Amino acid sequence: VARRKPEQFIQTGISTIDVMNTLVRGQKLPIFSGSGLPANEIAAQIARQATVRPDLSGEGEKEEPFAVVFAAMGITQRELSYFIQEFERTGALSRSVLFLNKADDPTIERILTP
Amino acid sequence: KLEAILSQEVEAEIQALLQEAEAKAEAVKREAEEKAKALLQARERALEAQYRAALRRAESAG
């Protein structure tokens, strides 16, 4: 009863998933991926692309900051380093925190991570 | 005379040709200027991208 309706939106730097289908305020949108396909890359790809644009509504990105809080688990040795690569590329790691429990870090720690 | 007919027949083709060929030498001069123009516009766009990105990188580092 302390929860209100969506009334704002975010922009992930893409076309089809922000024009044709607006990713709104506090939306829970799952991305069903396959197997034999790299989930992980197509993820972080959209990391740097995503910088919000509520410009057109009359609000800044100072009243909508770009904070990436990431919690994976059971990720490969390449992929876990390929993640940090994207971030360290261009400035976006002094406004975000990573957490990512390696596939060689115990199954007990998996759960609490989030 | 038949010959007074014929001289009007060359002077007729040889003006159409030379207007067609100054309507290609105009068209090319336009499309090339608008080309040259757009290839420096695109040059403008690139420079911004590469400077906006760069300043952010060097800020985050510091």
PDB file of C-alpha atoms in Angstrom:
ATOM      1  CA  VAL A   1       0.000   0.000   0.000  1.00  0.00           C
ATOM      2  CA  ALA A   2       3.310   1.880   0.031  1.00  0.00           C
ATOM      3  CA  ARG A   3       3.791   1.073  -3.727  1.00  0.00           C
ATOM      4  CA  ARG A   4       2.728   3.539  -6.515  1.00  0.00           C
ATOM      5  CA  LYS A   5       2.153   3.113 -10.357  1.00  0.00           C
ATOM      6  CA  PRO A   6       4.967   3.377 -13.011  1.00  0.00           C
ATOM      7  CA  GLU A   7       5.154   6.990 -14.227  1.00  0.00           C
ATOM      8  CA  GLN A   8       8.714   7.184 -15.557  1.00  0.00           C
ATOM      9  CA  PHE A   9      10.971   5.226 -17.940  1.00  0.00           C
ATOM     10  CA  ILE A  10      14.704   4.368 -18.505  1.00  0.00           C
ATOM     11  CA  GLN A  11      16.675   4.047 -21.721  1.00  0.00           C
ATOM     12  CA  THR A  12      19.177   1.237 -22.433  1.00  0.00           C
ATOM     13  CA  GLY A  13      20.579   2.747 -25.574  1.00  0.00           C
ATOM     14  CA  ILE A  14      18.689   0.348 -27.805  1.00  0.00           C
ATOM     15  CA  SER A  15      15.853   0.789 -30.295  1.00  0.00           C
ATOM     16  CA  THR A  16      13.445  -2.162 -30.413  1.00  0.00           C
ATOM     17  CA  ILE A  17      13.259  -2.680 -26.579  1.00  0.00           C
ATOM     18  CA  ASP A  18      12.624   0.962 -25.653  1.00  0.00           C
ATOM     19  CA  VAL A  19      10.614   2.195 -28.733  1.00  0.00           C
ATOM     20  CA  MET A  20       8.335  -0.718 -29.498  1.00  0.00           C
ATOM     21  CA  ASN A  21       8.183  -1.816 -25.828  1.00  0.00           C
ATOM     22  CA  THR A  22       8.828   0.768 -23.129  1.00  0.00           C
ATOM     23  CA  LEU A  23      10.947  -0.457 -20.121  1.00  0.00           C
ATOM     24  CA  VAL A  24       9.319   1.509 -17.402  1.00  0.00           C
ATOM     25  CA  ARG A  25       9.641   2.354 -13.684  1.00  0.00           C
ATOM     26  CA  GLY A  26      10.281  -0.630 -11.466  1.00  0.00           C
ATOM     27  CA  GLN A  27       9.418  -2.985 -14.134  1.00  0.00           C
ATOM     28  CA  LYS A  28      10.326  -6.656 -13.753  1.00  0.00           C
ATOM     29  CA  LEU A  29      11.072  -7.814 -17.406  1.00  0.00           C
ATOM     30  CA  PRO A  30      12.668 -11.243 -17.853  1.00  0.00           C
ATOM     31  CA  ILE A  31      14.996 -12.049 -20.765  1.00  0.00           C
ATOM     32  CA  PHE A  32      14.609 -15.639 -21.614  1.00  0.00           C
ATOM     33  CA  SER A  33      17.830 -16.827 -23.205  1.00  0.00           C
ATOM     34  CA  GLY A  34      18.767 -20.181 -24.675  1.00  0.00           C
ATOM     35  CA  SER A  35      21.503 -22.665 -24.232  1.00  0.00           C
ATOM     36  CA  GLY A  36      24.439 -22.885 -26.685  1.00  0.00           C
ATOM     37  CA  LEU A  37      24.224 -19.148 -27.058  1.00  0.00           C
ATOM     38  CA  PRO A  38      26.288 -16.733 -24.945  1.00  0.00           C
ATOM     39  CA  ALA A  39      23.750 -15.099 -22.516  1.00  0.00           C
ATOM     40  CA  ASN A  40      26.522 -13.277 -20.653  1.00  0.00           C
ATOM     41  CA  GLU A  41      28.033 -11.178 -23.571  1.00  0.00           C
ATOM     42  CA  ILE A  42      24.640  -9.816 -24.967  1.00  0.00           C
ATOM     43  CA  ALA A  43      24.058  -8.791 -21.371  1.00  0.00           C
ATOM     44  CA  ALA A  44      27.111  -6.437 -20.685  1.00  0.00           C
ATOM     45  CA  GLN A  45      27.040  -5.330 -24.310  1.00  0.00           C
ATOM     46  CA  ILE A  46      24.036  -3.234 -23.422  1.00  0.00           C
ATOM     47  CA  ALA A  47      25.881  -2.053 -20.224  1.00  0.00           C
ATOM     48  CA  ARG A  48      27.730   0.970 -21.778  1.00  0.00           C
ATOM     49  CA  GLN A  49      24.871   1.564 -24.307  1.00  0.00           C
ATOM     50  CA  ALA A  50      22.527   2.093 -21.449  1.00  0.00           C
ATOM     51  CA  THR A  51      22.686   5.638 -20.188  1.00  0.00           C
ATOM     52  CA  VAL A  52      19.136   6.804 -19.380  1.00  0.00           C
ATOM     53  CA  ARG A  53      17.244   9.392 -21.372  1.00  0.00           C
ATOM     54  CA  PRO A  54      14.215  10.903 -19.575  1.00  0.00           C
ATOM     55  CA  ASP A  55      15.236  14.202 -21.413  1.00  0.00           C
ATOM     56  CA  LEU A  56      12.039  14.263 -23.409  1.00  0.00           C
ATOM     57  CA  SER A  57       9.950  14.263 -20.159  1.00  0.00           C
ATOM     58  CA  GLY A  58      11.790  17.186 -18.525  1.00  0.00           C
ATOM     59  CA  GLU A  59      13.955  15.329 -16.034  1.00  0.00           C
ATOM     60  CA  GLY A  60      17.800  14.880 -16.074  1.00  0.00           C
ATOM     61  CA  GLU A  61      20.131  11.804 -15.563  1.00  0.00           C
ATOM     62  CA  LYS A  62      21.145  13.495 -12.252  1.00  0.00           C
ATOM     63  CA  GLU A  63      17.606  12.772 -10.950  1.00  0.00           C
ATOM     64  CA  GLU A  64      17.925   9.410 -12.684  1.00  0.00           C
ATOM     65  CA  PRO A  65      21.499   8.168 -12.214  1.00  0.00           C
ATOM     66  CA  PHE A  66      22.949   5.124 -13.891  1.00  0.00           C
ATOM     67  CA  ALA A  67      23.747   2.690 -11.144  1.00  0.00           C
ATOM     68  CA  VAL A  68      24.574  -0.885 -12.193  1.00  0.00           C
ATOM     69  CA  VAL A  69      24.400  -3.285  -9.311  1.00  0.00           C
ATOM     70  CA  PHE A  70      25.081  -6.740 -10.692  1.00  0.00           C
ATOM     71  CA  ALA A  71      24.822 -10.066  -8.938  1.00  0.00           C
ATOM     72  CA  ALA A  72      25.462 -13.225 -11.026  1.00  0.00           C
ATOM     73  CA  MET A  73      26.567 -16.570  -9.747  1.00  0.00           C
ATOM     74  CA  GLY A  74      28.128 -19.680 -11.338  1.00  0.00           C
ATOM     75  CA  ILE A  75      29.948 -17.850 -14.165  1.00  0.00           C
ATOM     76  CA  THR A  76      32.846 -19.135 -16.298  1.00  0.00           C
ATOM     77  CA  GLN A  77      36.527 -18.035 -15.858  1.00  0.00           C
ATOM     78  CA  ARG A  78      36.543 -16.115 -19.257  1.00  0.00           C
ATOM     79  CA  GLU A  79      33.111 -14.570 -18.788  1.00  0.00           C
ATOM     80  CA  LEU A  80      33.861 -13.294 -15.219  1.00  0.00           C
ATOM     81  CA  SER A  81      36.831 -11.325 -16.703  1.00  0.00           C
ATOM     82  CA  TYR A  82      35.007 -10.288 -19.812  1.00  0.00           C
ATOM     83  CA  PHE A  83      32.461  -8.551 -17.522  1.00  0.00           C
ATOM     84  CA  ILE A  84      35.035  -6.195 -15.648  1.00  0.00           C
ATOM     85  CA  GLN A  85      36.553  -5.506 -19.230  1.00  0.00           C
ATOM     86  CA  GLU A  86      33.449  -3.697 -20.428  1.00  0.00           C
ATOM     87  CA  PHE A  87      33.265  -1.551 -17.346  1.00  0.00           C
ATOM     88  CA  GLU A  88      36.968  -0.581 -17.204  1.00  0.00           C
ATOM     89  CA  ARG A  89      36.819   0.326 -20.945  1.00  0.00           C
ATOM     90  CA  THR A  90      34.960   3.573 -20.663  1.00  0.00           C
ATOM     91  CA  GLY A  91      33.924   5.383 -17.327  1.00  0.00           C
ATOM     92  CA  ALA A  92      31.109   3.505 -15.610  1.00  0.00           C
ATOM     93  CA  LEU A  93      32.861   1.576 -12.726  1.00  0.00           C
ATOM     94  CA  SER A  94      32.921   4.638 -10.424  1.00  0.00           C
ATOM     95  CA  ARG A  95      29.096   4.550 -10.311  1.00  0.00           C
ATOM     96  CA  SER A  96      28.420   0.825 -10.091  1.00  0.00           C
ATOM     97  CA  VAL A  97      29.364  -2.170  -7.854  1.00  0.00           C
ATOM     98  CA  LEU A  98      30.000  -5.868  -9.100  1.00  0.00           C
ATOM     99  CA  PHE A  99      29.381  -8.964  -7.160  1.00  0.00           C
ATOM    100  CA  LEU A 100      29.783 -12.279  -8.914  1.00  0.00           C
ATOM    101  CA  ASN A 101      30.255 -15.536  -7.341  1.00  0.00           C
ATOM    102  CA  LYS A 102      32.609 -17.661  -9.496  1.00  0.00           C
ATOM    103  CA  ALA A 103      31.723 -21.310 -10.554  1.00  0.00           C
ATOM    104  CA  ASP A 104      34.398 -22.436  -8.183  1.00  0.00           C
ATOM    105  CA  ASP A 105      33.247 -20.502  -5.209  1.00  0.00           C
ATOM    106  CA  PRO A 106      31.070 -22.985  -3.074  1.00  0.00           C
ATOM    107  CA  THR A 107      27.317 -23.522  -3.592  1.00  0.00           C
ATOM    108  CA  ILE A 108      26.608 -22.186  -0.101  1.00  0.00           C
ATOM    109  CA  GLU A 109      27.922 -18.642  -0.963  1.00  0.00           C
ATOM    110  CA  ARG A 110      25.825 -18.730  -4.243  1.00  0.00           C
ATOM    111  CA  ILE A 111      22.579 -18.123  -2.384  1.00  0.00           C
ATOM    112  CA  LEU A 112      23.629 -15.301   0.008  1.00  0.00           C
ATOM    113  CA  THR A 113      25.422 -13.208  -2.841  1.00  0.00           C
ATOM    114  CA  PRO A 114      22.179 -11.481  -3.871  1.00  0.00           C
TER     115      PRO A 114
ATOM    116  CA  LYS B   1      15.338  23.961-101.386  1.00  0.00           C
ATOM    117  CA  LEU B   2      15.894  20.622 -99.686  1.00  0.00           C
ATOM    118  CA  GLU B   3      19.157  21.893 -98.195  1.00  0.00           C
ATOM    119  CA  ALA B   4      17.580  24.636 -96.165  1.00  0.00           C
ATOM    120  CA  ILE B   5      15.538  21.953 -94.430  1.00  0.00           C
ATOM    121  CA  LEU B   6      18.543  19.855 -93.557  1.00  0.00           C
ATOM    122  CA  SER B   7      20.623  22.580 -91.775  1.00  0.00           C
ATOM    123  CA  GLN B   8      17.775  23.052 -89.290  1.00  0.00           C
ATOM    124  CA  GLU B   9      17.930  19.344 -88.483  1.00  0.00           C
ATOM    125  CA  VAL B  10      21.548  19.377 -87.059  1.00  0.00           C
ATOM    126  CA  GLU B  11      20.957  22.642 -85.372  1.00  0.00           C
ATOM    127  CA  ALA B  12      18.351  21.083 -83.140  1.00  0.00           C
ATOM    128  CA  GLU B  13      19.946  17.810 -82.108  1.00  0.00           C
ATOM    129  CA  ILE B  14      23.280  19.631 -81.302  1.00  0.00           C
ATOM    130  CA  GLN B  15      21.541  21.883 -78.796  1.00  0.00           C
ATOM    131  CA  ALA B  16      19.560  19.086 -77.013  1.00  0.00           C
ATOM    132  CA  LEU B  17      22.741  17.072 -76.544  1.00  0.00           C
ATOM    133  CA  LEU B  18      24.786  19.989 -75.090  1.00  0.00           C
ATOM    134  CA  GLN B  19      21.836  20.863 -72.639  1.00  0.00           C
ATOM    135  CA  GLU B  20      21.699  17.221 -71.617  1.00  0.00           C
ATOM    136  CA  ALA B  21      25.355  17.221 -71.075  1.00  0.00           C
ATOM    137  CA  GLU B  22      25.321  20.341 -69.025  1.00  0.00           C
ATOM    138  CA  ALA B  23      22.525  18.702 -66.978  1.00  0.00           C
ATOM    139  CA  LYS B  24      24.814  15.888 -66.161  1.00  0.00           C
ATOM    140  CA  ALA B  25      27.877  18.276 -65.449  1.00  0.00           C
ATOM    141  CA  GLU B  26      25.500  20.260 -63.174  1.00  0.00           C
ATOM    142  CA  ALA B  27      23.919  17.206 -61.439  1.00  0.00           C
ATOM    143  CA  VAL B  28      27.373  15.648 -60.708  1.00  0.00           C
ATOM    144  CA  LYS B  29      28.686  18.972 -59.324  1.00  0.00           C
ATOM    145  CA  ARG B  30      25.687  19.076 -56.974  1.00  0.00           C
ATOM    146  CA  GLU B  31      25.743  15.444 -55.753  1.00  0.00           C
ATOM    147  CA  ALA B  32      29.497  15.672 -55.155  1.00  0.00           C
ATOM    148  CA  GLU B  33      29.187  18.896 -53.175  1.00  0.00           C
ATOM    149  CA  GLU B  34      26.441  17.352 -51.053  1.00  0.00           C
ATOM    150  CA  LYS B  35      28.717  14.340 -50.778  1.00  0.00           C
ATOM    151  CA  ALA B  36      31.779  16.240 -49.641  1.00  0.00           C
ATOM    152  CA  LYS B  37      29.514  18.104 -47.181  1.00  0.00           C
ATOM    153  CA  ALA B  38      28.150  14.866 -45.671  1.00  0.00           C
ATOM    154  CA  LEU B  39      31.549  13.308 -45.369  1.00  0.00           C
ATOM    155  CA  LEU B  40      32.670  16.198 -43.037  1.00  0.00           C
ATOM    156  CA  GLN B  41      29.236  16.071 -41.172  1.00  0.00           C
ATOM    157  CA  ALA B  42      29.906  12.522 -40.313  1.00  0.00           C
ATOM    158  CA  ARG B  43      33.433  13.635 -39.409  1.00  0.00           C
ATOM    159  CA  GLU B  44      31.781  16.121 -36.947  1.00  0.00           C
ATOM    160  CA  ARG B  45      29.691  13.343 -35.341  1.00  0.00           C
ATOM    161  CA  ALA B  46      32.696  11.041 -34.759  1.00  0.00           C
ATOM    162  CA  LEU B  47      34.689  13.724 -32.903  1.00  0.00           C
ATOM    163  CA  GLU B  48      32.036  14.345 -30.350  1.00  0.00           C
ATOM    164  CA  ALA B  49      31.539  10.658 -29.630  1.00  0.00           C
ATOM    165  CA  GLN B  50      35.266  10.088 -29.135  1.00  0.00           C
ATOM    166  CA  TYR B  51      35.671  13.124 -26.776  1.00  0.00           C
ATOM    167  CA  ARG B  52      32.528  12.597 -24.693  1.00  0.00           C
ATOM    168  CA  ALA B  53      33.635   8.952 -24.015  1.00  0.00           C
ATOM    169  CA  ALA B  54      37.192   9.858 -23.369  1.00  0.00           C
ATOM    170  CA  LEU B  55      36.425  12.539 -20.749  1.00  0.00           C
ATOM    171  CA  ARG B  56      34.186  10.168 -18.901  1.00  0.00           C
ATOM    172  CA  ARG B  57      36.978   7.500 -18.834  1.00  0.00           C
ATOM    173  CA  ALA B  58      39.527   9.845 -17.496  1.00  0.00           C
ATOM    174  CA  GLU B  59      37.124  11.163 -14.900  1.00  0.00           C
ATOM    175  CA  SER B  60      36.105   7.710 -13.603  1.00  0.00           C
ATOM    176  CA  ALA B  61      39.839   6.787 -13.346  1.00  0.00           C
ATOM    177  CA  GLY B  62      40.667   9.879 -11.254  1.00  0.00           C
TER     178      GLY B  62
END
